[PDB]
Amino acid sequence: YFQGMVAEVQKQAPPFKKTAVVDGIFEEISLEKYKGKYVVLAFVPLAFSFVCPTEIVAFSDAAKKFEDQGAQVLFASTDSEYSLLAWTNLPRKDGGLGPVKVPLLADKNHSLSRDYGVLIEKEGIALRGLFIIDPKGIIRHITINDLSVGRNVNEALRLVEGFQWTDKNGTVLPC
Amino acid sequence: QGMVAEVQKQAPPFKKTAVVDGIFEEISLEKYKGKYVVLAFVPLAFSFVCPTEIVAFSDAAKKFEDQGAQVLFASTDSEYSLLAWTNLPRKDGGLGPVKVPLLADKNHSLSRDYGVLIEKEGIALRGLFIIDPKGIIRHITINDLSVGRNVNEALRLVEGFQWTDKNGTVLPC
Amino acid sequence: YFQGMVAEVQKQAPPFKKTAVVDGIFEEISLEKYKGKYVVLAFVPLAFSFVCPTEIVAFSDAAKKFEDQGAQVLFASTDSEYSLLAWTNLPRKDGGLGPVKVPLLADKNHSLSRDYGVLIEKEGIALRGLFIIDPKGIIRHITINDLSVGRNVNEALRLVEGFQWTDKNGTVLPC
Amino acid sequence: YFQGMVAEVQKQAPPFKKTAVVDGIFEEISLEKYKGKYVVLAFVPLAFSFVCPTEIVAFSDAAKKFEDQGAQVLFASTDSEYSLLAWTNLPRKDGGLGPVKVPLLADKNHSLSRDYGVLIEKEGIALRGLFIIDPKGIIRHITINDLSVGRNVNEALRLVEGFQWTDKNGTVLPCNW
Amino acid sequence: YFQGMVAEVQKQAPPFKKTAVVDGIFEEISLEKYKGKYVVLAFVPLAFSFVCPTEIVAFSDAAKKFEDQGAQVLFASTDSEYSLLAWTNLPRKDGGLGPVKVPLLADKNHSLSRDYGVLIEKEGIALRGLFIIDPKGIIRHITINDLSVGRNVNEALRLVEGFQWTDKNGTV
Amino acid sequence: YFQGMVAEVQKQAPPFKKTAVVDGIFEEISLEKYKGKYVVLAFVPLAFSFVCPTEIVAFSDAAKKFEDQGAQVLFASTDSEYSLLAWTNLPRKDGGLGPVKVPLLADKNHSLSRDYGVLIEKEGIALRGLFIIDPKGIIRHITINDLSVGRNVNEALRLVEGFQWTDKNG
Amino acid sequence: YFQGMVAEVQKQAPPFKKTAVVDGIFEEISLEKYKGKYVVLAFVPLAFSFVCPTEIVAFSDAAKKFEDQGAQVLFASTDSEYSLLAWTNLPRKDGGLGPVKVPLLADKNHSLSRDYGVLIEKEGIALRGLFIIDPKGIIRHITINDLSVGRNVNEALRLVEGFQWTDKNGTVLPCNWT
Amino acid sequence: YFQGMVAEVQKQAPPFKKTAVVDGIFEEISLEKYKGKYVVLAFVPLAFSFVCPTEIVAFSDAAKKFEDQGAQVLFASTDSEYSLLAWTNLPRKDGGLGPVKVPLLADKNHSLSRDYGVLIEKEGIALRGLFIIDPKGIIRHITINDLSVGRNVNEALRLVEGFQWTDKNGTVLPC
Amino acid sequence: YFQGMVAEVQKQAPPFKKTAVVDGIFEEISLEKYKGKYVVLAFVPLAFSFVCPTEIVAFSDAAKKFEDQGAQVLFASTDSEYSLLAWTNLPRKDGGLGPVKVPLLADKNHSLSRDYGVLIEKEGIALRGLFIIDPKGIIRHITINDLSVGRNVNEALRLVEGFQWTDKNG
Amino acid sequence: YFQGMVAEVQKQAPPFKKTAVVDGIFEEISLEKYKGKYVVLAFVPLAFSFVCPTEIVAFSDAAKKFEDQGAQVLFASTDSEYSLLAWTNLPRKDGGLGPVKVPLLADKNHSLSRDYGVLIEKEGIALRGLFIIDPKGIIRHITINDLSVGRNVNEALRLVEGFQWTDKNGTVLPCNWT
């Protein structure tokens, strides 16, 4: 990897070091921290708002399903740490997300959304990306949607599992 | 003019020789404006991994016709390679006569332009792209070569936009 | 506005038409709107920031005075239109900014905090500023103050009163 | 600082060395002279301006308040050291500035007002700029009142005195002073 | 030779390394494997054409007639090595090319079709080329035939014979 | 075709104008002249050389077969027109060649042999190039040999007859 | 003449537009205003200085003599028009300039000196140049001296009246006479 | 001094080395030769040129008045050294110059006039310039006369005797 | 011909218009007036030269010799017309060449000297050049000796004497 | 001569190396070969050209007169090596120049004709050149004639000796003496 590249499947993923909200406190999160696992990132338009984050509630509520089986879930938004933290902090009648079981990252300089070729430059928001990274820092799987349609946590899950297994074995189940 | 197919933007036009029911016919992305399109790439003509996903992929046609969507496969393999790979039976690893167009990107323009081309290897990737009737790409999937994509994801995601784009209104939630 | 520059005193203010939360609704707001009036532009901390009860309340209390004396204030920040809303809805007794009587002008794509050169792209945060802009669009009083300081409402209305006086009639006052 | 950056807050202020009128005699002034002790650099538009001289007198009275806090006041304009020295040497009552307790600067070569962004290129004069410079030579505040309005010395004083708080505490105080 | 060049007569042949089919097994045949020997480099464009490729069977059946003079036969095309392998396993009756004793190089990225300059960049295929490369790696020969017919078998022997006799004895 | 390009199969033939020996006398020959017959444009290395005559006599003697099939035969070289004409005068026993029935184009400034890129520049000579041009100005065949072995008489004639059929039929 | 060029004899003189001190009031002086007369353009380094430079006085009295001979004197400096104005309103005995009958131009933005090549960039003053510019706008004569020494006014008038004469006759004079 | 700038006031005199006619012989004159003296460089229009006999003779005649304050005088032109030679031999009485006691700097490839900027590009002669240089190599005064006004022995010298003294004093000089 | 070239045989020697010494006075000559005749331009090292007046008087002496064959003799040097004029008015005792019968041009500003490529930028002088311009404006001949040898006038227009007869004229 | 200068008087003679027809066989000729002698280089357009080859015969039959003085004659043309061969194998009655006493250089890639700029570039031929070259490899004389007129040998010799004689004493000769 060099600085100046956009993420491209099969190639080294751009590294980060960023402030993050973990279980209600501030923590510094990097890609090197998780090297040795797979790391899943998913993007969303807007904090503290509608659009019905079906997929985010799915992943975060499904966080456990990722953890044991060998995957690491990460969220991201172009907000600052204070908005994300406040939006896990506050209750649901205040428009909160409630506490979640996965690490959340604040990219407030846009570096990540720029890195993976998601950011909408005019709107300062992100399309719906889903990217999967391996323990060597390579991006195995990417899905991207427009902002009217959601995710599938189970598709990503089994695909993760499969790529994991096939890496060590080098085979792939037939058909 | 690197077009670089990207989500929520116009689809790059391409015109490529393709097989429609065992006969040579020119297929462009122009034909179906007004209809959805799912453009899916396969690694190799006569690949070595497994036949019987492929037999299941080639079988699904009516499912995108009911909800008003077109299926297309493309590869950097030649038009002829794809044809002959429909003409070989499945027992030998082939296909047989099938109902889906098989696009030939040998010239590398299409696959390059959508960013699924591996420039060193001159082979396609696991790509899948959804293009709406007005030309905007609403979805893309990419997997690493070794594991296949899923027809069910495409089928679901096309109808999500069927209903939501159809209404013209926000939805609860 | 050349499609260039940054920000400079005198020469006409960079125009913008974006969005804002005015009194809890999203009114489409442009600086074009306020031609014929003075406009005072003020930048604020990130959502859910860390500040005392008095300072913040002050400028909401004087919010009405700009409406009175013949001028319009624009709160703005590199924050998001939705997050800010969340930070007015949440009442003060619970730690939220509470209701404010001025527009909160939302720049999440960094346009506003970019034209005026207050954004340090590393932090994604805007430094304090006061820009006096006449009905003609000319930037006259520049203030970069800095993160920690109160936006002085008596200096802001001193500016409104005095500048408006000197261009409205033309005689200064000595000394 | 690299040779042609226009001054920007939080970054090393452009260093200068310039002819200056101090206490009726010529002296060279540069950033490096003042090291850690703060510096307040203020520009004045014109020597022998028709504007009220009072803006200046107050500054002298406030200089001592800047001194007790470990700060230093400075003045600058595109006028040459003869115009500025002539504008101090004439009594306050006769239309000049008379003697004052604060240094001046002769920018006759127009370097500073550029590098610091307070210059009007066509007029070859300075705006009302105010720069507050730190021990390590960092610009944490700038204010520009255009040309029709002078500055507020109690404002600037709270700003110096008040940034010493954030510096020496290492923290930001929403309500403190 | 700088990289980026096109094949030129009396000059070093552009180096290449590819995957190639040998008797139904993958092998990396590169170029250097054959140093010290004439190297017959032939391109056959995309397969599956009505016209009869009977001439290639003359080479394949005569390849022991060739090899005795110290030559290595190679064909190539822009298909994938799995594609080539499929057209190699398909018998000749049903439109394939079943038997071969000669390596078939798959260059789909075009490095081989592009580097010796037999290419149509828009068609992603070559013309019908042949390059005879001496033991030093120099291109001694260039033939290019159009798409309608093909090349000629005895010509290659006549020329390779000629360059053997002339390169050995010095007399022309 | 654009100027500066090199010829190739399927592409327009470069135009040129050159001094040439025709049945013993100078003439200005240009490619556009012969549009409407096939044209076999070949090159040969040097005047008063050794391998050349026995080869050249082959196509030269065939002039009636190529003019019967509606073709025109041309050789070219970087030697001077004078060297070709004198060559044509020198009789095969003592002579290099003997008089001949086919036009011969001498490019002494070297620009032509550049145009089709068969010229070996460092030596200022040309290989044995073989080009077949149709009435539309398209090259249907190319052969590039080295200097030690001649081409063939039968192959060009067989090829011209071969492409005629596909042109007119299918 | 084009923007950015340096003043050179035999070429069109760069025009000028500047705020100037004319008889106690501000007036903007331009070159097109004098077309039909010669213009003697001069420069002085700094207002409110010592050593009572008398070159200026010489160009004032001699300005009377020019207008008698039909020429126009102009100074200039990059001192601001307030410094110059204050220094004209200032009586001479105090170190001031006293009253003056010639226009005095303010170069405050340095645009003119860069075009006649008399500007000192790092010191921000103008050399002592002397340019005689005719109705056609051409420079026939150049005198540049170091700032420390005054010009000879008598030579200025000598040659000025000189080139008006030679311009009328269209031929050189072997021996100057007065 | 950098090659390509055309002299200036206060700036190093361009170095040059040019064959010169001195008292009927050829000698190499470089300005380095005169380091430690003042040097004066004047340009005469031509050789055998039509000019008043009295004006030309008087200027040449004074090398004593320059020597007495320790200064060297030099004339120059673009003609070849042989033409100027013939003009120093050819008696004044005949309409010529006559013998002359100061070197004659002739440059027929024009270098000198180019370095000092008096080269008239399309003529090939220089106007009447006279330059004063001190025992450093700095240019203290520059006069470019038009070709129709000769020099003034008193105006060329007066400034010289003045610079010797104003420099020598090393003290400020009262009004 | 181009603007900025030097000079080349057959590329039409750069024209000019330049002040010339003619029979003792100044007269304006260009390479125009002589269209229709040949012109021989020749350069000499110096004016007032200390070297060899004899060859010089012998050079000037031939004028009618070029008029009879329809040719015009001009010389050129970097000495000014005021520097070069004085050199025809001086007797031998002072080193004078004498009054001469052929025009002598002063190229002081170097335009020509540089144009024809004989100039030495360092020395600021021209080597002895010779050019023959034909009525049609084409350079038919050029000779350039180094400075140590003059011109054989026989070598000067001998070539002209040949060109008259090559033209055939009838 | 920096490799990409064109032949110019007093500058290093361009180095060149060529196959040549000398006395009925080939050979390699270089400028490097002769260092220590002068060299007189002449061009002629083409082989079996129907302008009279009297210019070539002149120097050739005179080759020894350009020798005893310690000089060497060189001919060059754009012809091939077998073109000059065929052109030396015709006796003069047939239009050829027969055997020759001087080296005949064959430049068929033009490097010599391009180096000295005597190429006619569109036609790939040569004008009639004559150049004088010193032992130190520097061109002190150049003559170009059109194709229509030859090059007098005697004049050329006259130009050959004097340069030698004056190089030896470093003294110029005012008035020439055979």
Side-chain angles (χ1 to χ4, degrees), chain B residues 33-79:
Chain B
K33 290 191 187 302
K35 295 184 64 57
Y36 275 92
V37 173
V38 179
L39 180 64
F41 288 94
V42 296
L44 296 162
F46 299 95
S47 63
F48 65 99
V49 171
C50 187
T52 64
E53 268 321 322
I54 301 169
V55 309
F57 292 116
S58 64
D59 290 344
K62 180 62 171 289
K63 281 186 175 294
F64 306 44
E65 181 178 1
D66 290 341
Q67 47 189 18
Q70 177 65 55
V71 274
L72 302 173
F73 298 29
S75 176
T76 58
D77 297 344
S78 62
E79 54 275 4

Side-chain angles (χ1 to χ4, degrees), chain I residues 8-10 51-52 54-55 127 139-146 148-150 152 155 158-159 162-163 166, chain J residues 9-10 117 119-120 127 140-146 148-150 152 155 158-159 163 166 173-176:
Chain I
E8 186 175 1
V9 175
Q10 283 176 328
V51 181
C52 177
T54 63
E55 301 310 322
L127 300 175
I139 297 167
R140 299 284 288 169
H141 170 63
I142 293 174
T143 302
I144 296 170
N145 288 339
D146 192 359
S148 179
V149 178
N152 192 342
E155 182 62 14
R158 178 185 73 86
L159 298 168
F163 291 111
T166 298
Chain J
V9 175
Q10 289 180 335
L119 174 66
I120 302 299
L127 295 170
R140 288 160 58 185
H141 176 61
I142 296 170
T143 300
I144 300 300
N145 297 339
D146 286 347
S148 63
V149 181
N152 187 30
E155 186 66 13
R158 186 185 71 83
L159 297 171
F163 293 161
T166 187
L173 178 64
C175 307
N176 191 32

Side-chain angles (χ1 to χ4, degrees), chain B residues 70-116:
Chain B
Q70 177 65 55
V71 274
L72 302 173
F73 298 29
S75 176
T76 58
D77 297 344
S78 62
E79 54 275 4
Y80 291 97
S81 295
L82 297 171
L83 175 61
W85 182 51
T86 59
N87 286 339
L88 184 68
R90 297 175 176 179
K91 55 186 172 61
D92 289 343
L95 303 177
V98 291
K99 304 309 294 183
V100 296
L102 299 84
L103 278 66
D105 191 7
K106 34 144 177 131
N107 67 44
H108 288 62
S109 63
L110 163 60
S111 59
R112 186 189 303 107
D113 287 344
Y114 298 4
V116 296

